[model samples]
Structures are given as structure tokens and as C-alpha cells.
Target: VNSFSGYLKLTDNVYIKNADIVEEAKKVKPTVVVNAANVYLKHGGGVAGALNKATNNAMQVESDDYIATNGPLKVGGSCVLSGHNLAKHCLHVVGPNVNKGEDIQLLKSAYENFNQHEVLLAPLLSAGIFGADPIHSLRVCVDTVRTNVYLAVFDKNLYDKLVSSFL
Candidate 1:
């Protein structure tokens, strides 16, 4: 059983959850947005395994039967990354834990998928450092994308500086 009870409203802006970012993009109809320095997974779970299953699972929905960008999963045979961009104006960035190369491939696949679409509102990038140093975390994610991408971090300070510095 799951229950939700709260009222969080900010006049300027608010970052509720990773998937909420996508929902907000759809609501606001922004031109370009970035969600970097965050973690992403499919409906079942991401690299964090089952720990993030409950929260992240609700974030993803089943997309059409398209070729999967990331590879298979260890926990389950049918496990696939959460389809955040499904019927939305966003791109989700996800990858395996401690594997930068694999993450880049995932990002590349998202871009390739974007090309097939017309208007790409936001692109979400998963931060590589789940439990690493700030600098190292920033380095891993920034190294993957050359363009001006957004950084989405659970760490508030880290997220601010990264976005402010780039913006």
C-alpha cells in the first residue's frame, strides 16, 4: 500500500522528483531544458537495484516496443530502464552503476531517439556519482555530454552550482 500526503508549492519553481521534471516540462511547454547529475532507471529499477524501486517505479511508464537503448538487467530478464520520455517532452539519462562507458552509450541512444522526434523539450542526465565526491560526480557526468546539459542532483548545493555555473 502507498499513500501520498503533502503540499509543496513554490511560486518560482520546484523540483519534486526526477519524473516530475518531465511532467513540469509538459505543463510549462518549455523550449529547452536539462536534467543532469541525477540517476535514472526504468519502471522496475535502475542501477541502485531494488532500493529505489518504489519511488522510481512510479516514475516510469511502459513505452511502445522500440529497441532498448541500454542492455539487459541482472535482477530480472525483462527489466528495462523506465521510459521517462514516453509521450512527453523530455529525454531520460540512465546507466549502470560505476560504468561511465555504458552510461554514455545510454545518453547517445537517447539522443539518437531524440533525432527521430521533432521537438525535444528537456534531456535528463543521470549523475554518475551516487555515493562519490562532488567533483568526481560532476566530472563523470560532464565528461559524457559536451553540450550545455543540465545537472540533476539529489545534493542541493551541487545541483545549484553546476546549473548556475553553466547558466
Candidate 2:
């Protein structure tokens, strides 16, 4: 596991934190934990997969049921999965897939769609499997969330790199 850590303050209440995502989620016990997903609500890969596993596949099961009735989860669309082990709620948003650079806007919209809370934990959207720059994605998150934001970082080298870029 990576040991690096750092944070960039987007505002007085908002922050981009580079640390263990799951560990931070447990520590903060955020009101909501946002997971980036596809329209199909597939949580078998990337950050979504990890979160789904941690929550005992509750996210995936809930998402599946939600999509069955509500239709494909759209870009910028969100659904809440409550009563999870780490968070009071899990907010699943359909994020961009291998985008032509519209990810920032989609990410912003996803954050905007969720209700404001005291604390929200979000992974860097479209940064890993989708190939967007982590810093840019994080900036969008920082700018969009209304309340306290904790940006989860899983990889130590990536965390260190992000910290250095801010400095």
C-alpha cells in the first residue's frame, strides 16, 4: 500500500485529499460516498468495483435493482444506496466512459445532482480506467461539491505526484 498523503484546499470546506480511499471513507464516515459507474450500473471494475466489494456488493445489487425500474443510469445521473458499512449512503453516478473530453462537465453535473451534506467522499472520476488527468478531475470535484469534499486516492505514487503538482 502507498503511504503518501496530502491535500489541496479548494475552498474553506472543500478539499482534494490524496490518501487511501477506503481508509479515509472509514475514518470520515461520510454521509455519502460517491462511486463512478457506467449506465449499466456495473460496479465490477475500478473504484466502483472496490467500493462494491467493500460494501459487500450492496452497491451493485442496489444499482441493478434501481436500473431495472428506472432505466439505464445516465451520464450525470445518480441513485442513492443507503445502509452501507462505511457510509450512511452510497451515491452512484454514471460517469463518462473513455470520453472525448466531456468528462469534466459530466463529473461536475454528477456532483451537482447529489444533495449537499456535511461530508462527501468521492474518488477521482474518470482518472484511472477512463484516462482523464487525476488533477483535472479532482479540480472539477472541488469546484462542484457544495459541502466538505474528501477526494480519495488509492495509489501512493499517484498521491505523491498530485501533491507535488500543487506545490
Candidate 3:
């Protein structure tokens, strides 16, 4: 909550939407990465596309033995999906967002998995421009997860505020 540490717990259920989160997570060398896809695709691209590229690129450089899996989601709905990270032993659960029953289950699964690893990282589900309320979404995640959750909120009053505002 105050500072990043050896075992990192990051949540951004709203901010990572449609962003390069997969690539970012890889850079962190996280023991695990869990995310949900509930964002709208305004441009021709979507979460699935970003994740595909990020995970594929990760496969080339990331060490093998990281587990990954995609969460549960309704059929027909489209989004970026990847299990390449899982090939390295990193679990990537791709499914519906917190609105469904996937959040707690996957979080618990990741927590248990972390017991066997050295580090862990999970992102909060972001509603993004699709209009999901940030506070409410976070509250749900809070109530569902009981682990030590960490959030890196950037400051807004500084010369480099533009760069620092993003976590």
C-alpha cells in the first residue's frame, strides 16, 4: 500500500483496460498475472489483440515455467485471449469481469499458486471508457480479495505530473 516490495500486489481493474498491461506485467517478472476482459472496443482493436501481441512477445523473452490461464467468459463475446504465459507456468485466467463470479475464484486460485512461487502480481479489473464505476468496481474487488492488496496511485501536483499521474 505504501511502497512496492519483493512480493507485489497490484490492482487496476479499471486502468489496465485496453492498455499494454501484459507487457508491463512481464517486465515486473511477476509470479502470476490475473486479469478480466470487460472493456469495449472502440477502435478496430480490443483487449484480445493487445494481450496477443504482449504474450507472444513475452514468450520470446520470458523464461519458461511461468503458468498462465484465461478466466471464464460467455461464448460469442470477443476479447484478447492468451495462454502463452501459461506455457512458462504463469496462470492467465481469461473470462468475464468481476460482474460475473470469476473474480474471487481466480484470485483465490492465484493466491494458492503464489504459495509455491517467489512473487505474485494481479491487476484490478478496470471498467475503462466503457463506463464502469471505478470506486464501486474496486470495492467489489476489495470485499472479494482478502490478501494484502497494493495500489500505486500517482501524484497530480508536480512538473512531471503527466508522467507521474499514471501508475
Candidate 4:
């Protein structure tokens, strides 16, 4: 687990945090544990993989059911998933793959998905192999986000960038 935590103040009633997202959500419930998911809506590595592991097998079973109903999940779009024993719910968000000339708004759209809810817990979408700059991801999220938020950053580099940029 990433044994680190910190806070950043923002405008309006919303708040931001840099924390051990996996642990926090597992320890206590959040409105949603937003996953920076793949269009396939399956688990592999990074934050998304961690959550799928933590949320247990049923989560995938439900995810498969969702896929059976819908098609391949949409990049830059989101859907609710069973949080199982983690948070109250899981928000599966497929972020932008920057290589496709589709970066900013697409990832921002994921952040916007959290806006409609009360409390949002998420990692910096697209900051992994998806090719998003950490700062760019953070900017799109905070610039576009509102309401209670925990920027669930487990990567040390991503965490540092967010906290440094804030300061």
C-alpha cells in the first residue's frame, strides 16, 4: 500500500486530496471509487488492476454482465459498477488514449462524470500508458471537478506532481 496522504484546498465547496486511494476506499466507504478503466472494461495493471483485485471476483462477474448488456465500454465515458465490499459503488471510467489526438476533453469527460455525484475518489486518468502528462491530467480533473474529491494517487511521481503543482 502507498503509505502516504496529504490535502490541498480548492475553490468552492469541493476539496482535493493526495492519498493511498486503494487503502482509503477499502478502509471506509466513499460514494464511488472511480476506476481509470480500459475500453474493454477489464483489469490489467495499475490502479484499475488493484481495485479489481481488492473488490473481489464478483466485481468482474458483474463487469462481464455489464459488457454483455452494453458493448465494449466507451473511452471518455463512464458507467457505474458494483463496489462490492469496497466503496458504495465503483465508477468505471475509460480515459483518453492521448496518442489518438484525443486527450484533454476525453479525460476531462471522465472527471466530469464524477461531478454529477457527491463524493468522488479517483486516480489521475490517462496518466499511465494512456500518455497523459501528470500535470495535464490533474489540471483537467481539478479544473473540471466539483464536490467532495479524493485524488486517489498511489504513484509516488503522480502524487508529487499534484502536490507540487498545488503548492
Candidate number of the best lDDT = 4
For candidate 1, the TM-score is 0.36
Cα lDDT computed for each candidate against the true fold: 0.34, 0.71, 0.36, 0.74
For model 1, the local distance difference test gives 0.34
Question: Which tens-of-lDDT digit does each residue in 33-92 have in candidate 2?
Answer: 887777788888788888788888877788788878988877777777773787788777
Encode model 1's per-residue lDDT on 1-167: one tens digit a residue: 11111212111122222334344444444443332323323334332322223224334333222224553332101222343323223333333333443433344433333333333333233343422244444444334333333222444565555445531
TM-score of each: 0.36, 0.82, 0.41, 0.85
Steric clashes per prediction = 8, 0, 29, 0
Kindly indicate the candidate among 1 and 4 with the higher TM-score: 4
Q: Which residue runs of candidate 4 sit more than 4 Å off their true CA positions? A: 1-6, 13-18, 99-102
lDDT of 3 by residue, 65-104 (tens): 2212333333213232234653234333232344444443
As for model 4, its CA RMSD to the true structure in angstroms is 3.7
Q: In model 1, which residue pairs have backbone atoms overlapping below 3 Å? A: 36-150, 36-151, 36-152, 37-152, 38-127, 41-82, 42-81, 42-82
Candidate 4 per-residue lDDT over residues 82-136, each given as its tens digit: 7888788999888887866675677777777888777777788888767888878
Residue runs of model 1 more than 4 Å from their true location after superposition: 1-41, 44-61, 64-89, 99-134, 160-167
